[PDB]
Amino acid sequence: DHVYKIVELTGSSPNGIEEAVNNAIARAGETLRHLRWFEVVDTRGHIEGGRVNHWQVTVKVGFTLE
Amino acid sequence: DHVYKIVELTGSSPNGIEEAVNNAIARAGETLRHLRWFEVVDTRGHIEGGRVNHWQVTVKVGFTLE
Amino acid sequence: DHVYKIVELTGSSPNGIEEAVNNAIARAGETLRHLRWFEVVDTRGHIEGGRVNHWQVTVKVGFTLE
Amino acid sequence: DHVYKIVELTGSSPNGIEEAVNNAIARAGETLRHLRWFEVVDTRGHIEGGRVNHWQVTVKVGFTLE
Amino acid sequence: DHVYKIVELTGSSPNGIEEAVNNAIARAGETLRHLRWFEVVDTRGHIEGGRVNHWQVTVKVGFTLE
Amino acid sequence: DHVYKIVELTGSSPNGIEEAVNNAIARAGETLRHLRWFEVVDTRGHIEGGRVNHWQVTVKVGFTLE
Amino acid sequence: DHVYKIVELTGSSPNGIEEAVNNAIARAGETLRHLRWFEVVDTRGHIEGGRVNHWQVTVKVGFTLE
Amino acid sequence: DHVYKIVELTGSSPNGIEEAVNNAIARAGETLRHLRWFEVVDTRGHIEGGRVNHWQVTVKVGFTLE
Amino acid sequence: DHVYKIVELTGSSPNGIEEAVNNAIARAGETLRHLRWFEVVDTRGHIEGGRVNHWQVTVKVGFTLE
Amino acid sequence: DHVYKIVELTGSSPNGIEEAVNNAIARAGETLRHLRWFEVVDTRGHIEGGRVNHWQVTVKVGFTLE
Amino acid sequence: DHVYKIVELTGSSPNGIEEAVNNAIARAGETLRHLRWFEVVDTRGHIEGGRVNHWQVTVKVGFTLE
Amino acid sequence: DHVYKIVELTGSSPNGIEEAVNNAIARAGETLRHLRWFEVVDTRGHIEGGRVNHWQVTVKVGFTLE
Numbered sequence: 001d002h003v004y005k006i007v008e009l010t011g012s013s014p015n016g017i018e019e020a021v022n023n024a025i026a027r028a029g030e031t032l033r034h035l036r037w038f039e040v041v042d043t044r045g046h047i048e049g050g051r052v053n054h055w056q057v058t059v060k061v062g063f064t065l066e
Numbered sequence: 067d068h069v070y071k072i073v074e075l076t077g078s079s080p081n082g083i084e085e086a087v088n089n090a091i092a093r094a095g096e097t098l099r100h101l102r103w104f105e106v107v108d109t110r111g112h113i114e115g116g117r118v119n120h121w122q123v124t125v126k127v128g129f130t131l132e
Numbered sequence: 133d134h135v136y137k138i139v140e141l142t143g144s145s146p147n148g149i150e151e152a153v154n155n156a157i158a159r160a161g162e163t164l165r166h167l168r169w170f171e172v173v174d175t176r177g178h179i180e181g182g183r184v185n186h187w188q189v190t191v192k193v194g195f196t197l198e
Numbered sequence: 199d200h201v202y203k204i205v206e207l208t209g210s211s212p213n214g215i216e217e218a219v220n221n222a223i224a225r226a227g228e229t230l231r232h233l234r235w236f237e238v239v240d241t242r243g244h245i246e247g248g249r250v251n252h253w254q255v256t257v258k259v260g261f262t263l264e
Numbered sequence: 265d266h267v268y269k270i271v272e273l274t275g276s277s278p279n280g281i282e283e284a285v286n287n288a289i290a291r292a293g294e295t296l297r298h299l300r301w302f303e304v305v306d307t308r309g310h311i312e313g314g315r316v317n318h319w320q321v322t323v324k325v326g327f328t329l330e
Numbered sequence: 331d332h333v334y335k336i337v338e339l340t341g342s343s344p345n346g347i348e349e350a351v352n353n354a355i356a357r358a359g360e361t362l363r364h365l366r367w368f369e370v371v372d373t374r375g376h377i378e379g380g381r382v383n384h385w386q387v388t389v390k391v392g393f394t395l396e
Numbered sequence: 397d398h399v400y401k402i403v404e405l406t407g408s409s410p411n412g413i414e415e416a417v418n419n420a421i422a423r424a425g426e427t428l429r430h431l432r433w434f435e436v437v438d439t440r441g442h443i444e445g446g447r448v449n450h451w452q453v454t455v456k457v458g459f460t461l462e
Numbered sequence: 463d464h465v466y467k468i469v470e471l472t473g474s475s476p477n478g479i480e481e482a483v484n485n486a487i488a489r490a491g492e493t494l495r496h497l498r499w500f501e502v503v504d505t506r507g508h509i510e511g512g513r514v515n516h517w518q519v520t521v522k523v524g525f526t527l528e
Numbered sequence: 529d530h531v532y533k534i535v536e537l538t539g540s541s542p543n544g545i546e547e548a549v550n551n552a553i554a555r556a557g558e559t560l561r562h563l564r565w566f567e568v569v570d571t572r573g574h575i576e577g578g579r580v581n582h583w584q585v586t587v588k589v590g591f592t593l594e
Numbered sequence: 595d596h597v598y599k600i601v602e603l604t605g606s607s608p609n610g611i612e613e614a615v616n617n618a619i620a621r622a623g624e625t626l627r628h629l630r631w632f633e634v635v636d637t638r639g640h641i642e643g644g645r646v647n648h649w650q651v652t653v654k655v656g657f658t659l660e
Numbered sequence: 661d662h663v664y665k666i667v668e669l670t671g672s673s674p675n676g677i678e679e680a681v682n683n684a685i686a687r688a689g690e691t692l693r694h695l696r697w698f699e700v701v702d703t704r705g706h707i708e709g710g711r712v713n714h715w716q717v718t719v720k721v722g723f724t725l726e
Numbered sequence: 727d728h729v730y731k732i733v734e735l736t737g738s739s740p741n742g743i744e745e746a747v748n749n750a751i752a753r754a755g756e757t758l759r760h761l762r763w764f765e766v767v768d769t770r771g772h773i774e775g776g777r778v779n780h781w782q783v784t785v786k787v788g789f790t791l792e
């Protein structure tokens with residue numbers, strides 16, 4: 001039966017990890033269809049002043065190809 | 067002296083990463099004894115609609131065998 | 133152009149992942165200068181009673197050497 | 199001269215590993231062109247009753263961009 | 265919500281890879297309950313004469329703890 | 331705030347590593363927009379006679395989705 | 397044929413690496429049966445004063461399930 | 463006691479994974495002696511038309527040196 | 529006898545990989561002493577226009593502590 | 595609460611692994627303070643004649659920053 | 661059809677990465693036959709004065725056994 | 727200048743890790759020439775009764791080809 005595609009995206013947020021991945025999954029939902037699962041590959045961030053100003057979570061999203 | 071066992075559990079939460087690991091550690095605490103440390107091995111999730119509905123954190127938990 | 137040094141630090145917090153990394157980055161900012169980016173290498177923790185009492189996030193922080 | 203794109207797909211089959219990858223490569227062949235090589239990244243599966251009902255092989259497929 | 269345990273088992277078979285994992289999953293199903301997914305970690309084997317006499321596939325099996 | 335996509339490309343050159351990645355980035359720039367960073371994942375090549383005739387560098391390219 | 401379970405243990409010793417793994421295998425031998433092979437995953441330790449006071453070797457032990 | 467050498471071979475087959483490794487092991491058995499164990503390192507393949515025409519399993523074979 | 533320290537630095541150059549590492553090693557040579565070996569951990573870069581404007585090679589440098 | 599720094603050192607000894615790491619930890623203890631834990635990253639060595647004359651164990655040492 | 665052997669060599673050069681691998685492939689072509697592909701495993705080097713005097717690229721070369 | 731070959735051997739010993747590698751390096755020195763360095767890839771062992779009877783250290787040995 002089924003075939004899936006896995007794209008790598010990195011979501012950003014000034015607020016934290018969960019927010020960063022949700023942004024990435026929201027932006028994927030706009031353009032792709034049948035989002036099933038994801039996997040966090042990596043957590044990074046930008047430092048401004050002496051503080052984190054962007055959390056950057058890169059993520060693999062699995063979705064059904066029809 | 068002592069010997070430790072490491073078990074692999076994956077906790078689930080609709081709320082996020084810290085809640086998902088806490089759930090895993092709570093469930094381990096009911097059945098095992100002398101939980102000492104843990105390590106996150108992996109963060110994954112399920113997507114429903116175009117949103118994350120389950121954060122799935124898999125974790126290794128170390129505990130003393132007596 | 134520029135050369136950067138990457139140091140490995142692990143931040144601690146009784147509250148969670150983002151707080152743990154912020155602590156690490158705060159302490160780095162006191163002593164180093166020109167902090168540019170970071171990467172999370174590893175999330176660990178201590179368990180007291182049957183609950184997490186310390187989140188330990190180890191992180192690599194990149195900063196410009198002048 | 200040539201530049202290649204690598205896409206990550208996961209093929210499914212109730213029958214086994216080879217069949218799962220063939221399904222993934224068939225579905226890629228429908229939409230893409232000049233498939234040259236593949237690499238198995240990962241073998242997973244779903245368990246129903248106490249038996250495997252889906253073999254899930256994830257695969258990287260390299261193809262020529264023209 | 266839910267919590268899963270992941271155990272590592274290595275199944276054996278003189279016939280090949282799918283049979284080896286099925287054996288492992290069968291033996292897990294006898295003793296454990298609510299087997300949900302698995303992941304192949306590793307494929308090894310024993311060589312007798314100049315031929316493979318045992319396929320050894322080590323696998324991670326996830327199951328719901330209730 | 332922002333969201334990035336990461337695509338995997340492998341560039342080719344009969345001259346060497348830098349040229350191979352530049353080709354890949356050139357070809358990505360024709361079709362994609364807002365290329366921000368890249369990472370080398372892997373260096374391979376084809377041998378013809380007893381000499382390298384193609385350097386194949388596979389690379390991950392990050393770019394802003396708008 | 398045979399199906400094996402692999403458990404992860406970490407043995408401790410104030411003396412060194414071999415002693416640490418032997419303690420882990422001894423404690424496994426008390427409770428499990430048909431220990432066949434082991435693999436070292438990791439060597440760690442505790443530092444007291446400015447000296448190692450515990451060698452911590454984590455180890456995967458494979459054993460036959462009957 | 464003994465000392466072993468591990469050589470890396472990749473076997474090929476138009477039929478599948480088990481056949482590919484058997485070929486590699488057969489060819490090793492012709493030239494080497496006392497083949498004891500193997501480990502799969504990697505599964506790759508060539509695509510011709512839109513179909514797999516070669517399965518290429520690379521494998522590490524351990525054998526006793528006398 | 530001798531004990532070594534390994535620091536992680538990332539060198540930059542608009543020209544390529546070797547120049548980037550040389551810059552890192554030059555800047556290490558100014559401040560440290562007895563540089564013995566290095567290892568490349570990682571090759572990254574910045575893209576400006578549709579072209580690489582900085583090669584970023586991160587490197588581990590080993591040097592004798594006396 | 596607390597923040598730790600992890601430094602990478604490689605200790606040497608003509609005698610063996612434990613001696614090598616002890617030398618590394620001794621040299622760290624002279625200069626740094628509040629050494630808490632270590633992890634072995636890697637074991638290497640130099641061969642002179644047809645024998646090992648230096649054991650080189652590289653190690654990560656964690657210590658409290660105050 | 662076929663069977664390949666992979667050997668691991670490390671080529672050296674005072675000039676850089678491409679030269680180092682070419683040396684390794686040249687020396688392999690003298691003694692082996694039917695060199696098909698290679699893969700860079702690792703880039704290291706020796707530092708003399710405060711400068712790189714040898715680039716050491718270790719490489720895996722695949723060649724047809726007939 | 728120079729070119730090195732890396733071979734993978736696994737040394738055995740009922741006594742421990744250092745002895746097992748020394749055996750591997752001794753057996754390599756009988757047949758090969760100009761052994762320069764080695765790296766430990768892996769520590770395994772056989773369990774007899776409830777005790778380790780063979781320590782199996784696999785090692786990569788680098789030697790000059792002339």
Ligand SMILES: Cc1cc2nc3c(=O)[nH]c(=O)nc-3n(C[C@H](O)[C@H](O)[C@H](O)CO)c2cc1C
Binds near residue numbers: 045056136169170586
């Ligand atoms: C090796 C390397 C890694 C970097 N990683 C990141 C990153 O993960 N996130 C980020 O926002 N910027 C990253 N940067 C950009 C960094 O913040 C940069 O030095 C300044 O943004 C421009 O000098 C990286 C730069 C280098 C050289």
Ligand SMILES: Cc1cc2nc3c(=O)[nH]c(=O)nc-3n(C[C@H](O)[C@H](O)[C@H](O)CO)c2cc1C
Binds near residue numbers: 122
């Ligand atoms: C390779 C692969 C990985 C998957 N990983 C997950 C996961 O991490 N979490 C999850 O809830 N479901 C996972 N699923 C199940 C996925 O959500 C599935 O397609 C639907 O649940 C049923 O089609 C996975 C499926 C595949 C094929």
Ligand SMILES: Cc1cc2nc3c(=O)[nH]c(=O)nc-3n(C[C@H](O)[C@H](O)[C@H](O)CO)c2cc1C
Binds near residue numbers: 104128177186440452
């Ligand atoms: C292999 C190993 C790993 C450990 N990792 C951690 C850790 O990540 N964080 C921590 O607070 N303690 C850690 N500990 C210490 C653990 O909590 C310890 O058993 C008690 O603190 C003292 O016995 C570790 C201990 C061992 C043996």
Ligand SMILES: Cc1cc2nc3c(=O)[nH]c(=O)nc-3n(C[C@H](O)[C@H](O)[C@H](O)CO)c2cc1C
Binds near residue numbers: 242
């Ligand atoms: C960490 C994790 C990994 C999973 N991986 C897979 C998978 O690889 N394939 C799959 O079909 N389902 C997967 N699932 C879904 C699993 O079968 C799930 O529990 C049920 O499908 C719904 O509860 C996964 C779930 C979790 C939590």
Ligand SMILES: Cc1cc2nc3c(=O)[nH]c(=O)nc-3n(C[C@H](O)[C@H](O)[C@H](O)CO)c2cc1C
Binds near residue numbers: 309311466499770
């Ligand atoms: C490093 C090492 C790895 C081994 N791996 C396996 C294995 O994966 N499967 C197996 O049946 N035997 C394995 N053996 C045992 C091997 O077959 C052994 O030499 C004979 O069984 C007894 O000498 C291994 C032995 C060593 C030293």
Ligand SMILES: Cc1cc2nc3c(=O)[nH]c(=O)nc-3n(C[C@H](O)[C@H](O)[C@H](O)CO)c2cc1C
Binds near residue numbers: 374376377472697722
């Ligand atoms: C395991 C494997 C890996 C290969 N890798 C490459 C590669 O990285 N680049 C390439 O041009 N060809 C590669 N080839 C193709 C190789 O050059 C092939 O043997 C001839 O091109 C056709 O026989 C590979 C073949 C195999 C079996």
Ligand SMILES: Cc1cc2nc3c(=O)[nH]c(=O)nc-3n(C[C@H](O)[C@H](O)[C@H](O)CO)c2cc1C
Binds near residue numbers: 142441
């Ligand atoms: C990231 C991390 C890793 C640690 N790993 C270990 C370990 O491997 N062994 C150990 O005995 N203690 C470990 N500890 C505990 C460490 O010794 C701790 O700081 C003191 O024991 C209590 O502060 C670890 C602590 C942290 C934060």
Ligand SMILES: Cc1cc2nc3c(=O)[nH]c(=O)nc-3n(C[C@H](O)[C@H](O)[C@H](O)CO)c2cc1C
Binds near residue numbers: 202236506507508518
């Ligand atoms: C990065 C890369 C990896 C490759 N891997 C393989 C492989 O695993 N097996 C294979 O038969 N050919 C492989 N090839 C060769 C591929 O099939 C090639 O593009 C055509 O054979 C000649 O253009 C590879 C080529 C590249 C550039």
Ligand SMILES: Cc1cc2nc3c(=O)[nH]c(=O)nc-3n(C[C@H](O)[C@H](O)[C@H](O)CO)c2cc1C
Binds near residue numbers: 392572573574
């Ligand atoms: C996950 C991630 C990785 C990045 N890595 C790098 C890098 O390696 N080098 C770099 O110069 N900039 C890097 N950047 C910064 C990137 O160029 C950035 O999007 C722009 O510099 C500012 O938006 C990175 C950014 C992200 C989100």
Ligand SMILES: Cc1cc2nc3c(=O)[nH]c(=O)nc-3n(C[C@H](O)[C@H](O)[C@H](O)CO)c2cc1C
Binds near residue numbers: 648763
């Ligand atoms: C890829 C590579 C790795 C090396 N690793 C080591 C090492 O781990 N320890 C060491 O003492 N020397 C090492 N050497 C140096 C080696 O012993 C060298 O050939 C002689 O010391 C000088 O020719 C290495 C050399 C190369 C080319």
Ligand SMILES: Cc1cc2nc3c(=O)[nH]c(=O)nc-3n(C[C@H](O)[C@H](O)[C@H](O)CO)c2cc1C
Binds near residue numbers: 532564566638652716
């Ligand atoms: C952990 C370690 C790694 C080393 N790696 C290398 C290497 O990659 N190349 C090299 O030429 N020498 C290497 N050396 C040798 C290093 O240059 C050595 O300190 C001097 O050559 C003799 O003291 C290494 C030494 C150690 C201890």
Ligand SMILES: Cc1cc2nc3c(=O)[nH]c(=O)nc-3n(C[C@H](O)[C@H](O)[C@H](O)CO)c2cc1C
Binds near residue numbers: 274320400432770782
């Ligand atoms: C996955 C696997 C790994 C093994 N690894 C080893 C090993 O590292 N050393 C060894 O002596 N035997 C090893 N064996 C052989 C093991 O000891 C075996 O069960 C008995 O020797 C014959 O049943 C392995 C067997 C399996 C299935």
Ligand SMILES: [Cl-]
Binds near residue numbers: 008206338
């Ligand atoms: Cl990917």
Ligand SMILES: [Cl-]
Binds near residue numbers: 054056
């Ligand atoms: Cl950003």
Ligand SMILES: [Cl-]
Binds near residue numbers: 039
């Ligand atoms: Cl996945």
Ligand SMILES: [Cl-]
Binds near residue numbers: 074272404
């Ligand atoms: Cl595990």
